[PDB]
Write a protein that binds this ligand. Structure first.
Ligand SMILES: Nc1nc2c(ncn2[C@@H]2O[C@H](COP(=O)(O)OP(=O)(O)O)[C@@H](O)[C@H]2O)c(=O)[nH]1
Ligand SMILES: [Mg+2]
Ligand SMILES: [Mg+2]
Ligand SMILES: [Mg+2]
Ligand SMILES: [Mg+2]
Ligand SMILES: [Mg+2]
Ligand SMILES: [Mg+2]
Ligand SMILES: [Mg+2]
Ligand SMILES: [Mg+2]
Ligand SMILES: [Mg+2]
Ligand SMILES: [Mg+2]
Ligand SMILES: [Mg+2]
Ligand SMILES: [Mg+2]
Ligand SMILES: [Mg+2]
Ligand SMILES: [Mg+2]
Ligand SMILES: [Mg+2]
Lengths: 123, 62, 8, 672
RNA sequence: AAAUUGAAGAGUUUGAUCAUGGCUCAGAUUGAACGCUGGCGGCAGGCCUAACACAUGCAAGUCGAACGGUAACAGGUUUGCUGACGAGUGGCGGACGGGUGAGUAAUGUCUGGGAAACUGCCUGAUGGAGGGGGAUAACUACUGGAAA
RNA sequence: UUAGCUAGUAGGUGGGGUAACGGCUCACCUAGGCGACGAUCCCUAGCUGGUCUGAGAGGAUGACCAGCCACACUGGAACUGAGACACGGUCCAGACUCCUACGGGAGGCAGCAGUGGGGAAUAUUGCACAAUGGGCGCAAGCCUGAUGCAGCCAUGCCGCG
RNA sequence: UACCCGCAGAAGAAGCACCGGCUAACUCCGUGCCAGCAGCCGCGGUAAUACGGAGGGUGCAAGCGUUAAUCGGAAUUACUG
């Protein structure tokens, strides 16, 4: 359940270390972003010489959430942190070339086959 | 830095890729470099038949 | 300033 | 190591969306099944493997008028041509242009009608359109048994047998069967037309046919080859590159009806340099090596790839070459030929074949590569003049150095794309054959090179002129406060000179009489006035068509100096310009437009919508010529609007004519 | 016997002078570059920058006289029977040769010493080399993975 | 325009450890040790035989050839072996890139050739083990981008037209 | 392959800098503090051996100039001195 002001760790190698959701996209009065939801973000921390710089505003896809996801059998998969993969503002494609940490089959859509194929573990 | 274009005609404009070599222009304070003519964007002096190598002018077809 | 034939 | 020079060099040319990429993909599939953009080599026997497997050099040429440059180079280099026509579209605007490019190089061509399966598609209609719009003779080698939804295959007129392809095998297996009786009633008449055309070319077969003896298949096929080489006729076949029916047969027709490298006329050129002696290089290995460079490209893991066509002679690795056009000595190594599956190193390239020489350091597009001994200069390929120009300014100041390198690299690979820096605005202006062409170069500069840029409209070079004459303009410059001061007094008359009176457009009159102004100071006054023209008082634009008269003045024995008189002249010039009526001038272009008669009203109206004034109109056998005088500021992206009005069938040329004054609304806009 | 038998000045501060004092020039050199030009041979040299990133081919294998076996080839439906040896076990090499100068102001290098050591292959000497045990690759059968 | 630095630090005793000596390591004991003959810290740097220049002293330099040192994507660690904490070995971690059927896999040109990039600037994806070496083998042989050559280049010297 | 022999025929093969002094080598024409030149001094505003060109000369030569860099001259860090 990611809302505006939520800080998320970055799962890619774009160079952003921490990001803040500034808007949950996809609806008017939309409140929460879960796994697989695109959110506008601002880089609050970035490594030097990275592909992204502190203050940049761009889209991101939420890949791991502490609230977790629900499976059709009632199973719940939860993580110990909220993490996102930064996406180009226009093409909604991943800025980085590597994905760190597990991801959920919730991202197995056509837009996110890149992320799925690069994740170390998909559960 | 500042460089001196030498010869009667210069084609240099803005954003011109050129090659610079040492050489101070006594009467110009701060100009300690000379543009090389005949190199990259910079061209050779037109109708030059003496010291053509210094000004990068090809041998006349004569 | 305005076309390949040079000119304004 | 030589194939018997039975390779079929061909180029796929058609209107956009016609099927050029689908057809070529199917060509690679069928030739590849027979075995156990960019140039490609395949191997094609017959469908029944009747023909000896021949190398097929296939290039899919781009349909867009924006990318016409590639069609030009392809038609010249490629001996044969295959024109794809959409069955619903028939002869669309671009397909009309590609015909003319083939006409320029006299390239023998056959026609494949694609999209037979599509609804409302008629094979005969497209043949009728080919005869009426392109003014050419179309002969149906193959008729189509099925139409639209009921399209099931393509019938063969020469054998008078229906061909059924296998839907399950993806068209891999051909079948031969009787023509349905409903289809046959039409087939007989078309087969008679095929026979009639073959007889005309041979003349010997013509008398035999008139007597009444049936022409041989061996003899009809021969005569049809004869006439395609003559360029008198075109051969039409129909197929669906999606339903996988018909493409296979068209290839066998290409091999049996198109020219070999030997069949085409030998390339013409200037032997050595000077005297314009005809090179007359015959296309054969024995004659001195001759080649031309087309479609140069760059690879990250390979050296620059320079695609070349060897007309005569054989080139090898470690072989010296001469760039006749650039006067540059060259050497050849690492040649590669690209098959559909892979690219392979080849030690030698026989005449009549195309390959890509990796690492050719001095070879741009349109360069003639020949042996240093016995040099030959084949002419450079036709390069079209750009039709639209836009200003490119880098989004970041740092990108300016990178952008210039990037646009130059794009300009080296593509002849049509041009780059320059206008002296007035010092802006980078790019020129291209279409709006889309410029857009793709911009995207490449961003996607390929790391340089994003801002598109803009070029800044027009405004001029200033004077209306009305102001007399008795006096300018006194005095700086005397102790020691040596500078004193100069000049009385001048600023008048508007006529536009055509003198080449400079400026006249200085030494009307001084007596010793009022010493002769030595008059040149300094003239120098100050010329300097003022360089930066106009109102808007900073250069002054033009203006002359002045110096009639009186004053001096001092110690104070007067050349510099003092120049500054006094500058003061007087400004005062006179302020009172004389200063008007900005807008450059006017003489524009000539060739338009189809139907759209002449639309083009004339568009020119009238612009502040342009029509000065002429010539009706022509092909098109209607319109002459108009239009300010260059109004002439921006004119090609886009002109193409929208005329279905991209109209071309325009322009030349700077004169600097007529701008309208007040535009002139005030320029001042701001 | 012979094996450094080796050291040059000039221009420019002044109206002129002398001193001081810089600046500049004449010489040699270079992993050079550039501009113009270019017949040839011999010999040498050739990323000085990003120890930047590297597509591809190759740069370390060999031994059947260690051993089971013989895939395959060649001879005398078949075999290890032979030549010869794929794969495998075993031995040896792979620490050499080749590249580069990032690090390193001394833990390195050079100069001269030392004392408390090791050392395949090579070499000289003196002997021995006795007699057994268990296992395992390849292999066969089965089975998993797109491949590894 | 770096004055203090050090606590296994400095030494002793015992144990362990290494092929070997040794705070090498550990326990205890003592309170040492270095430093204006510049310790510590900071910047820079492979070192040498030599080279260039200078009458010489000296100054500059360390490309090529030979000796030595160090390094092998980055950081760490061991294994085997006489010998490596190993360029084309292993394990881990990190950055990066590639293959995939999406389950997982793979790699390291500062070898030679070669490409992009940077730069004023620097070469062929050549041939052969014939010679000289090296590895293996009884040898024959095989392997050898060592080496021998060949290409490119007025880059230098030298000779000639 | 080096090398040697036979053939044909002057045939296939010269450029680059410089000339005020320092520093070897001079006049004319254009130009008129402009355009340019320049290592240093300095030249050019109407007879410019200093600029641009022509003729003539000079230096070197398959090279010749220019820039960069090192040492010398610099006793201009002087141990010699
Ligand atoms: N129905 C039908 N569609 C076709 C056929 N050939 C090509 N197309 C479609 O036409 C579209 C454009 O074809 P393309 O090869 O891109 O044409 P190009 O732009 O001339 O290269 C493709 O998406 C094809 O699906 C055909 O024979 N039948
Ligand atoms: Mg296409
Ligand atoms: Mg359409
Ligand atoms: Mg290096
Ligand atoms: Mg170092
Ligand atoms: Mg270093
Ligand atoms: Mg001395
Ligand atoms: Mg061990
Ligand atoms: Mg190794
Ligand atoms: Mg390696
Ligand atoms: Mg290499
Ligand atoms: Mg570069
Ligand atoms: Mg090998
Ligand atoms: Mg003299
Ligand atoms: Mg002369
Ligand atoms: Mg000295």
């Amino acid at each position: 359940m990611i809302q505006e002001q939520t800080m998320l760790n970055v799962a890619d190698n774009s160079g952003a270390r921490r990001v803040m959701c500034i808007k949950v996209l996809g609806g008017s009065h939309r409140r929460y972003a879960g796994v697989g939801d695109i959110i506008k973000i601002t880089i609050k921390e970035a490594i030097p010489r990275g592909k992204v710089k502190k203050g940049d505003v761009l889209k991101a896809v939420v890949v791991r959430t502490k609230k977790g996801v629900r499976r059709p059998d009632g199973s719940v998969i939860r993580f110990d942190g909220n993490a996102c993969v930064l996406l180009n503002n226009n093409s909604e494609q991943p800025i980085g070339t590597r994905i760190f940490g597990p991801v959920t089959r919730e991202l197995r859509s056509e837009k996110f086959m890149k992320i799925i194929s690069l994740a170390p573990e998909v559960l | 830095v500042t460089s001196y274009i030498g010869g009667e005609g210069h084609n240099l404009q803005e954003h011109s890729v050129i090659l610079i070599r040492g050489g101070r222009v006594k009467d110009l304070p701060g100009v300690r470099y000379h543009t090389v003519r005949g190199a990259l964007d910079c061209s050779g002096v037109k109708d030059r038949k003496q010291a053509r190598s210094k000004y990068g002018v090809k041998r006349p077809k004569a | 300033x305005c076309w390949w034939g040079x000119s304004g | 190591t030589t194939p018997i020079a039975r390779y079929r060099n061909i180029g796929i040319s058609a209107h956009i969306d016609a099927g050029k990429t689908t057809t070529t993909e199917r060509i690679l599939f069928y030739t590849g099944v027979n075995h156990k953009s960019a140039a490609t080599t395949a191997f094609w026997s017959g469908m029944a493997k009747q023909y000896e497997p021949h190398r097929i050099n296939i290039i899919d040429t781009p349909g867009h008028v924006d990318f016409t440059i590639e069609v030009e180079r392809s038609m010249r280099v490629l001996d044969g041509a295959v024109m794809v026509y959409c069955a619903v579209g028939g002869v669309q605007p671009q397909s009309e242009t590609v015909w003319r490019q083939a006409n320029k190089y006299k390239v023998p061509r056959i026609a494949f009608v694609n999209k037979m399966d599509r609804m409302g598609a008629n094979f005969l209609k497209v043949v009728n359109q080919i005869k009426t719009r392109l003014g050419a003779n179309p002969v149906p080698l193959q008729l189509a048994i099925g139409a639209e939804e009921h399209f099931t295959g393509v019938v063969d007129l020469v054998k008078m047998k229906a061909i059924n392809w296998n839907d399950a095998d993806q068209g891999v297996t051909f079948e031969y069967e009787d023509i349905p009786a409903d289809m046959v009633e039409l087939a007989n008449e078309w087969h008679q037309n095929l026979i009639e055309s073959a007889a005309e070319a041979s003349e010997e077969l013509m008398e035999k046919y008139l007597g009444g003896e049936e022409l041989t298949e061996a003899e009809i096929k021969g005569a049809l080859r004869q006439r395609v080489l003559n360029n008198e006729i075109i051969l039409v076949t129909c197929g669906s590159a999606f339903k996988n029916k018909g493409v296979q047969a068209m290839l066998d027709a290409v091999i049996d009806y198109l020219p070999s490298p030997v069949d085409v006329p030998a390339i013409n050129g200037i032997l050595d340099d000077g005297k314009d002696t005809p090179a007359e290089r015959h296309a054969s290995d024995d004659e001195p090596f001759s080649a031309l460079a087309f479609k140069i490209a760059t690879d990250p893991f390979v050296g620059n790839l320079t695609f070349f066509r060897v007309y005569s002679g054989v080139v090898n690795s470690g072989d010296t070459v001469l760039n006749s056009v650039k006067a540059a000595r060259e050497r050849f190594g690492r040649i590669v030929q690209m098959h559909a599956n892979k690219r392979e190193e080849i030690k030698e390239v026989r005449a009549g074949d195309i390959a890509a020489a990796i690492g050719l350091k001095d070879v741009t597009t349109g360069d003639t590569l020949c042996d240093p001994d016995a040099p030959i200069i084949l002419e450079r390929m036709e390069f079209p003049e750009p039709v639209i120009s836009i200003a490119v300014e880098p989004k970041t100041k740092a990108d300016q150095e990178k952008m210039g390198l990037a646009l130059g690299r794009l300009a080296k690979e593509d002849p049509s794309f041009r780059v320059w820096t206008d002296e007035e605005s010092n802006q980078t202006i790019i020129a291209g054959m279409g709006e889309l062409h410029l857009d793709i170069i911009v995207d490449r500069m961003k996607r390929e090179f790391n340089v994003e840029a801002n598109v803009g409209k070029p800044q027009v070079a405004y001029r200033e002129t004077i209306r009305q004459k102001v007399t008795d303009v006096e300018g006194k410059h005095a700086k005397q406060s102790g020691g040596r001061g500078q004193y100069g007094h000049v009385v001048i008359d600023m008048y508007p000179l006529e536009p055509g009176s003198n080449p400079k457009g400026y006249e200085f009159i030494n009307d001084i009489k007596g010793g009022v102004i010493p002769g030595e100071y008059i040149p300094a006054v003239d120098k100050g006035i010329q300097e003022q023209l360089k930066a106009g008082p109102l808007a900073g634009y250069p002054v033009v068509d203006m002359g002045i008269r110096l009639h009186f003045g004053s001096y001092h024995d110690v104070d007067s100096s050349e510099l003092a008189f120049k500054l006094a002249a500058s003061i007087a010039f400004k005062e006179g310009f302020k009172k004389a009526k200063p008007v900005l001038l807008e450059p006017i272009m003489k524009v000539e437009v060739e338009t189809p008669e139907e759209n002449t009203g639309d083009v004339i109206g568009d020119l009238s919508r612009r502040r342009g004034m029509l000065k002429g109109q010539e009706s022509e056998v092909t098109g209607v010529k319109i002459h108009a005088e239009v300010p260059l500021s109004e002439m921006f992206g004119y090609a886009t609007q002109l193409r929208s009005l005329t279905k991209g069938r109209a071309s325009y040329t322009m030349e700077f004519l004169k600097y007529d004054e701008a309208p007040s609304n535009v002139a005030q806009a320029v001042i701001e």
